[PDB]
């Protein structure tokens, strides 16, 4: 309504403030431009007009999308392009270029760089082999892979449409075209990079015959081909651009593609539709597990690869792994999980707040984020006691005695995380969110009182039901409000199930199905014949209160109790079952009054439900798996050689190109640079303003032939081509730089002298090769902040979602939050206390205190740059990190070129920068562990300029070519549109899982984001099922990084797997991981005998040793590329694993055999010399051979 619009008006004001500063500062002519070089937009229309034009196109695109939508308005704009409504482009290929770029831009919503980084060129060719007719040829580039198949595939569609609009002909390849292309398929898939979908060759020729436009471009790898020199293909190497666009594009996403054909009604694609369709008695729970095992196949992708150090947490679909609970906590939900921090500690602190554990069921790539309300592990202490460990602090207390982790406990999967990946719903574990629903439903069908969980009911109903139940009205209030965090004691649970008839409470439900009926039978007899059972009675209900039985009688059943998750202790050779669970171990067993006979075809719960007045539902039925991966980050962004100023220095600084060494050493440089000339005075130098008089200096142009120098206006006349040379005028030239006098002028200008070093750039890679002013380098160094290729300072951080936050968590005063606009918490109540859950507005972000501790330095930088160098008032005045609150930061992805303005509203302690998922989506993230950049606003304004952008390799990172200032979740992304924003999953769902309905069979029930688009109440109110206590509580740095040696890396990685039930190392954590060890050593050994050589100084490595051992230019020696220390690097571990763990003999004999090969490969260079005095400490190799 109005609050939200006040919000966006607010951000628009402060952004306008920042632009005021940057326009004044840039106005001084000191920088490469006289204007700010990051335009702001508001929609995808603005993003397309400013990314790829043409001028004015946004105004039209907004209307046409207003009438027809996204897809249709794309093609309409294409028409007005070719119809010249925006002016004359000139040649036909320029109209092709413009319409194709604007088209694909509007189609991907301008958030990626395919329209820029990917599509290399567009050309009009002739079927000179077939009939010489015209067609359209698209030149991609490797970075198109970044923008994924879909945007790639749409590039085809536009390529087909444009040529039709341009009256061009279809393409008609010859069989050499086709077979060379398929060859590119097999080779590129085989050696370069594994395609996501590897199509068959027949499919490849299918597309080759059926795509009227040419999928081509410049070759991407040095891989020669067999169908060389085909007519028109000007290269005989693999074209990864054409290849990827071919395979992972129209092929990998042909379904969605013909969806766009249908939405656009573009003829000539029926073959793709055909390709699409061408590609397309007995107890209750016993039956349920049966159908469950058949319809839902236990995937095994995540366990395919096991890098060393990456733990495996549970075998696929194995009971004992992450018990599953549908839901969506405050943090999780976009693509992450939640998890009880207890299970993050008892796994020896591998997992952190953000370590991307690779999942198997809902989709590969779940981030982890704490959720304290779900139930953490069940462990077995060393002294035999079994302990349920739900909370963090108890986990710290007992981490040392953990003898076995029976149950990893919960993992809160979102629902929409099923909808998108299109997983079949797994049967829901019996969780209180479903219990309480059966509660209120029973009270309605019985006593006609209407309650509702997770809210606040009317007092009358509360008291009435209090009466029919005989329970505290206060207590019933609390249980109805937060059922997760408030559990009625066991006797109330028995009583509720008794009166109301609903099943037993989940929290007191054992894991009865992890035990076959025989075992529980045996336990029944033991209990009946030997236990000592003190009884009790609550409201006429008879329930046990303590059990004790000597371990001699019990014996093997002790394992049974262990599998039932039954918390019990051992004292004096006696098993002790204390109060809150001794009732749970016997109430389902009917207090030992009705005999338990293992009946075939029944699961244990089926029997118990068959003979008990108290009915259960299974608590453990769905079991996800996972394997750790790609742990958290919040580092800085340092270039590979750390940089602190963009000023080419060549070799003159040494290895690290430290400019200050070249200064004090007084050397002189020869580096390509640009010089400007003071028109007033006639001074010349690589700076922008004059030393003599202080006016702006005109660029100097150079002929590479005649070495002619021309001021800018002159070379403007000459069109930047020589008068007496027919060559283009370069802007730069390999020149002579005096680092001394320059750096002296810098220190003179900004008044800073105490720089330890000033690391420069070995060579300008930008097109202009215009160098940054040195003053900025001095200020960076003085504060110790690093730079990135555009001139902006970035800060990678693993991003995770949130949507509601308790101001306790983030360290913010409630008055401050009242100053940012946050009036009322999520239930509408007035914000008064630091423990009410507020709703994060869309573009706010909670930075990690890393980001505070670094962006603080960026603040001191930007101040000292405003004052000392531009001569302006300070702007941040940051002294602690909590001064930044309210100042905008541009969140930017890799692979894209449109950043999103955000506002900071606090800090947490973990290493993960939170944000509203609309933010993380509009930044194009997957939030399956992706990492993002976060620069400060006024920095990126003051220090960015396209002139610094490298000219050729648009890589995985790119720069904020334009910044959005207003989320619209329409043109954000797709993957947001599936979030579950319901306060509690409805009863109909939980019952709807059991028959394994696919998710779309019930999308209409559960609210989502697609079910609020267009309306204003996209931003207004979302919700979440599960509370956390802290967003940051839990081990804040993965144990992976404090592990140095592979030798004991594997000893931790596989130290764990003895602990858990689920993993079963003793045979497969090794052998998977052991298989990895075998491959590296063998590969190195095979390669070693075929290697190359190389000197430190004459990089030139002769594919053979020169007999002398000397080198060119050098009079030196040649080093060995792949050194013998490398071949032997994993024998210690891999031999260890084989001597310890039952591994299949094939891999054992392979390893001992590879030992013998390492020795006999060197029995003539490193002879056997040093005898040893203690021989054969039982090595598996020799002791194996003695067999």
């Amino acid at each position: 309504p109005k609050e939200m619009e006040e919000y966006f008006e607010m951000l628009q004001r402060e952004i306008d403030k920042a632009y005021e500063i940057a326009k004044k500062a840039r106005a001084q002519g000191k920088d490469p431009s006289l204007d700010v070089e990051i335009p702001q937009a508001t929609d995808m229309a603005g993003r397309v007009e400013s990314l790829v034009g043409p001028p004015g196109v946004a105004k039209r695109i907004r209307e046409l999308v207003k009438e027809y939508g996204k897809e249709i308005a794309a093609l309409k704009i294409v028409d007005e392009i070719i119809e010249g409504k925006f002016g004359d482009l000139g040649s036909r290929e320029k109209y092709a270029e413009q319409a194709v770029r604007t088209a694909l831009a509007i189609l991907t919503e301008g958030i990626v760089s395919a329209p820029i980084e990917g599509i290399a060129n567009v050309k009009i060719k002739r079927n000179t082999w077939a009939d010489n007719s015209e067609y359209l040829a698209l030149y991609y580039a490797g970075p198109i892979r970044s923008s994924g198949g879909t945007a790639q595939a749409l590039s085809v569609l536009v390529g087909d449409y444009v040529r039709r609009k341009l009256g061009l002909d279809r393409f008609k390849p010859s069989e050499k075209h086709i077979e060379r292309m398929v060859e590119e398929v097999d080779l590129y898939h085989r050696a370069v990079t594994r395609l996501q979908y590897h199509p068959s060759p027949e499919e490849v020729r299918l597309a080759m015959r059926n795509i009227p436009i040419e999928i081509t471009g410049e070759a991407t790898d040095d891989v020669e081909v067999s169908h060389r020199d085909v007519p028109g293909v000007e290269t005989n190497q693999l074209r990864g651009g054409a290849i990827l666009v071919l395979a992972e594009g129209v092929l990998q996403k042909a379904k969605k593609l013909v969806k766009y054909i249908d939405k656009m009604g573009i003829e000539g694609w029926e073959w793709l539709k055909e390709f699409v369709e061408a590609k397309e008695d007995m107890g209750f729970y016993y039956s349920l597990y049966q159908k469950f095992k058949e319809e839902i196949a236990p995937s095994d992708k995540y366990a395919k690869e096991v890098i060393g150090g990456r733990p495996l947490f549970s075998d696929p679909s194995k009971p004992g792994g992450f018990r599953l609970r549908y839901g969506r906590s405050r943090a999780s939900g976009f693509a992450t999980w939640g998890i009880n921090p207890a299970t993050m500690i008892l796994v020896d602190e591998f997992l952190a707040i953000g370590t991307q554990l690779k999942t198997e069921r809902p989709g590969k790539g779940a981030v982890v984020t704490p959720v304290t309300t779900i139930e953490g592990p069940i462990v077995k202490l060393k002294d035999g006691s079994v302990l349920r460990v739900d909370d963090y602090n108890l986990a710290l207390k007992v981490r040392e005695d953990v003898e076995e982790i029976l149950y990893l406990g919960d993992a809160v999967i979102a629902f929409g995380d099923f909808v998108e990946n299109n997983q079949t719903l797994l049967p829901a574990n019996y969780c209180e969110e479903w219990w309480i629903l059966e509660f209120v439903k029973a009270l309605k069908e019985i006593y006609e009182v209407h309650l509702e969980p997770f809210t606040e009911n009317e007092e009358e109903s509360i008291e009435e039901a209090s009466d029919y139940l005989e329970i505290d009205p206060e207590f019933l209030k609390e249980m109805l409000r937060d059922p997760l965090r408030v559990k009625p004691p066991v006797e109330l649970a028995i009583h509720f199930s008794e009166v109301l008839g609903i099943p037993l409470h989940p929290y007191y439900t054992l894991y009865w199905n992890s035990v076959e009926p025989k075992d529980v039978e045996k336990l029944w007899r033991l209990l009946k014949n030997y236990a000592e059972i003190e009884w009790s009675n609550f409201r006429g209900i008879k329930f046990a209160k303590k059990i004790v039985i000597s371990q001699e009688k019990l014996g093997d059943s002790k394992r049974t109790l262990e599998l039932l998750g039954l918390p019990h202790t051992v004292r004096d050779g006696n098993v002790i079952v204390d109060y809150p669970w001794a009732a749970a171990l016997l109430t389902p067993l009917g207090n030992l009054n009705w005999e338990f006979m293992a009946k075939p075809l029944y699961a244990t719960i089926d029997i118990i439900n068959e003979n008990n007045e108290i009915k259960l539902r299974d608590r453990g039925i769905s079991w996800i798996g996972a394997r750790m991966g790609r742990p958290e980050k919040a580092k800085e962004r340092k270039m590979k050689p750390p940089v602190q100023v963009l000023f080419p220095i060549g070799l003159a600084g040494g290895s690290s190109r430290d400019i200050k060494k070249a200064a004090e050493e007084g050397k002189v440089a020869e580096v390509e640079i640009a010089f400007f000339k003071c028109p007033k005075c006639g001074h010349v130098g690589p700076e922008h303003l004059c030393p003599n008089c202080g006016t702006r200096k005109e660029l100097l142009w150079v002929c590479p032939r005649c070495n002619a120098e021309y001021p800018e206006s002159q070379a403007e006349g000459y069109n930047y081509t020589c008068p007496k040379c027919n060559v283009k005028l370069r802007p730069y030239a390999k020149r002579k730089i005096r680092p001394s006098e320059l750096l002296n002028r810098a220190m003179e200008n900004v008044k800073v002298y105490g720089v330890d070093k000033l690391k420069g750039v070995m060579g300008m890679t930008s097109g202009w090769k215009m160098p940054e002013p040195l003053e900025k380098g001095l200020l960076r160094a003085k504060n110790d902040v690093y730079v990135f290729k555009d001139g902006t300072i970035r800060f990678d951080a693993t991003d995770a979602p949130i949507t509601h936050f308790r101001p306790r968590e983030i360290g913010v005063s409630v008055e401050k939050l009242r100053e940012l606009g946050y009036t009322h918490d999520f239930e509408g109540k007035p914000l008064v206390s630091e423990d009410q859950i507020v709703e994060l507005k869309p573009q706010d972000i909670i930075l990690s205190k890393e980001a505070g501790r670094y962006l603080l330095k960026v603040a001191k930088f930007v101040d000292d740059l405003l004052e000392k160098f531009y001569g302006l008032p300070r702007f941040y005045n940051a002294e602690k990190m909590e001064d930044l609150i309210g100042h905008l930061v541009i969140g930017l992805a890799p692979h894209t070129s449109a950043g999103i303005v955000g506002r900071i509203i606090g800090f947490v302690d973990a290493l993960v920068g939170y944000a509203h998922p609309y933010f993380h989506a509009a930044k194009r993230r997957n939030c399956d562990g992706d990492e993002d950049a976060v620069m400060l606003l006024l920095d990126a304004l003051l220090n960015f300029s396209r002139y610094y952008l490298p000219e050729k390799r648009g890589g995985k990172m790119d720069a904020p070519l334009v910044i959005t200032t207003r989320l619209d979740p329409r043109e954000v992304d797709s993957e947001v549109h599936n979030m579950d924003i319901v306060r509690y999953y409805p009863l109909e769902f939980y019952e709807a899982t059991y028959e394994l309905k696919s998710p779309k069979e019930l999308v209409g029930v559960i609210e989502r984001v697609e079910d609020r688009l267009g309306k204003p109440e996209m931003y207004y109110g979302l919700k979440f099922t599960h509370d956390t206590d802290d967003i940051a509580l839990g081990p804040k740095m993965s144990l992976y990084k404090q592990l140095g040696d592979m030798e004991e890396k594997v000893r931790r990685q596989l130290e764990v797997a003895k602990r858990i039930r689920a993993v079963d190392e003793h045979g497969v954590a090794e052998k998977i991981l052991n298989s990895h060890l075998i491959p590296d050593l063998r590969g190195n050994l095979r390669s070693f005998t075929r290697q190359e050589f190389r000197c430190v100084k004459c990089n030139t490595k002769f594919r053979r040793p020169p007999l002398n051992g000397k080198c060119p230019v050098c009079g030196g020696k040649i080093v060995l590329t792949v050194s013998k220390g490398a071949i032997e690097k994993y024998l210690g571990t891999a031999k260890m694993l084989v001597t310890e763990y039952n591994v299949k003999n094939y891999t054992r004999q392979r390893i001992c055999l590879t030992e013998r090969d390492i020795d006999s490969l060197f029995e003539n260079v490193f002879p056997e010399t040093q005898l040893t005095l203690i021989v054969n400490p039982n090595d598996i190799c020799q002791r194996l051979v003695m067999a």
Binding site: E1168, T1169, L1173, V1175, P1177
Partner: protein
């Protein structure tokens, strides 16, 4: 629960360094007789045998007998922080810590968490040692440093009343002869011709930490391990056992 008082902490730190340069962890068999050490390199090429009779200590208080398990690296940095004459004290009570007290001009207290050491005991008594020679420290130290120039394997040759060392590489040649007549050769006990070769690296780890006023014993036979020995305050001496090559 013991306490121990040793003077000249810098010396003791030196010898503990000596043991340190070959192994990384080790256990100290403290008995009421004295402190004992015995361990072997990772390579199973050298055996360090430390023997410390209680007599050497200015005070020696052991109640029973126990094995200490310590990080030789951490202890090496610690003891290395002592100086020429400051007094060393080693205390241990109930808890699983070792308390090192360096008291010279002042008292300084350190605590070291003891570490479990999987003990692999290999006791190797007297063996057939053809020749046996005593020699000043700096003689052998100089010699090893010389063989470091030309090769990595130093060859020893013991003949009647004459001890000669040698080593040869690609081109260069290194020879060091000396007999009883010579000053540095205190004693020779020639049973017959002996010859061996040893890793110059290991020897360098051995003889570092030897002044001119250091007497060294060397027993060995034809193609078999050397046993080196030298005394420490004339009571507790250290003995290395180096396997030959080839």
């Amino acid at each position: 629960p013991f306490e121990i008082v040793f003077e000249g902490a810098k010396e003791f730190a030196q010898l503990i360094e000596t043991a340190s340069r070959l192994i990384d962890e080790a256990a100290f068999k403290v008995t009421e007789e004295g402190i004992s050490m015995r361990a072997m390199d990772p390579s199973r090429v050298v055996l360090i045998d430390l023997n410390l009779p209680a007599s050497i200590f200015s005070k020696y208080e052991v109640d029973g007998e126990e094995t200490i398990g310590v990080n030789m690296d951490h202890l090496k940095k610690v003891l290395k922080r002592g100086k020429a004459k400051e007094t060393l004290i080693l205390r241990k009570g109930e808890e699983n810590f070792l308390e090192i007290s360096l008291q010279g001009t002042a008292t300084r207290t350190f605590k070291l968490p003891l570490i479990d050491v999987e003990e692999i005991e290999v006791d190797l008594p007297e063996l057939p040692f053809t020749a046996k020679v005593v020699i000043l420290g700096d003689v052998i130290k100089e010699a090893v440093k010389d063989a470091s120039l030309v090769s990595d394997s130093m060859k020893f040759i013991a003949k009647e009343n004459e001890f000669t060392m040698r080593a040869e590489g690609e081109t260069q040649e290194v020879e060091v002869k000396l007999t009883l007549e010579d000053e540095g050769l205190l004693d020779i006990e020639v049973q017959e011709e002996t010859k061996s070769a040893y890793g110059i690296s290991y020897l360098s780890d051995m003889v570092k930490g030897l002044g001119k006023a250091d007497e060294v014993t060397i027993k060995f036979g034809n193609e078999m391990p050397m046993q080196m020995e030298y005394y420490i305050r004339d009571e507790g001496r250290l003995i290395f056992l180096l396997a030959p090559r080839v």
